[PDB]
Symmetry: C3
Subunit: 112 residues, 3 copies
Amino acid sequence: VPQEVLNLPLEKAHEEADDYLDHLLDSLEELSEAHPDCIPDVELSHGVMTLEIPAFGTYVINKQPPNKQIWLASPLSGPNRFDLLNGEWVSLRNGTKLTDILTEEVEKAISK
Amino acid sequence: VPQEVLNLPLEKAHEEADDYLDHLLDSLEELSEAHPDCIPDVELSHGVMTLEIPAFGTYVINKQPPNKQIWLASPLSGPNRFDLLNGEWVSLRNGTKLTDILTEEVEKAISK
Amino acid sequence: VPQEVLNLPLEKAHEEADDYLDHLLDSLEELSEAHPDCIPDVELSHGVMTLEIPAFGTYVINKQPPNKQIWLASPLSGPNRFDLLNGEWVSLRNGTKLTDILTEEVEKAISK
Ligand SMILES: [Co+2]
Ligand SMILES: [Co+2]
Ligand SMILES: [Co+2]
């Protein structure tokens, strides 16, 4: 019934997971230079993001319906799922930032 | 297969968000007296509740499918989304009770 | 587009609730010996598990779509719903492990 809501420059919020992934893509395809191209490819299609790291295998990162929201399948650290706590994404299993998991794993490759 | 469950005075639980909103409506349309009618209207239709506060703009409060459950769009403090912690509703972003956000904002109007 | 993901021995993850319930069933139908058969039956069909405890009434335990995931209806302690925290399931209301609720309630029967 109210109008003084839809004459605002109105907008559907983003999906909180969607926003993480897009920020990860340009953070990661930027890191897709600091390899001797031994982390050669990262692609994101429809909330599925694949990350080729030949040293370990291939990563798959998902948007997922909840008992939680972002799903990580690590060729190295295994599978894990994450939901928002205080505005960072966190393992339901134990509570670790996936930011940290990815961070560590990515840079364990740069060593090689 | 068991009967001694359905000869109980049986009942579908409520939606936890639904219960919050109904409690907010009579808490707020009661506060729709303690204004010099400068918070003139509050309506709740189908899990959408609008709150007119001319001083700031119009509030919209939603039931929402999860990465969390109650969605707040504040003409003043902006958007935010909330899920249950220990039986109160809490910003996924930072962890603040929306009870508090609403409380503060409502009474920042009573000042005027 | 990537193959070196689907020539892995691939697998859909389980539902975190599903895994809890299956572990509860054999933990409970094992306890369906340590009664003077006064906790005579426990059945699990399609993510609905019923538990007959004549002393108190019948329990129903559910897989549920979220503002949380496992739903408990206790003939004794009432209803409650639970989501993962740090890999254990926890009352949204107050934060107690349902493991504990069930544990206590089950063994309050063994007293009799
Ligand atoms: Co969480
Ligand atoms: Co929460
Ligand atoms: Co929780």
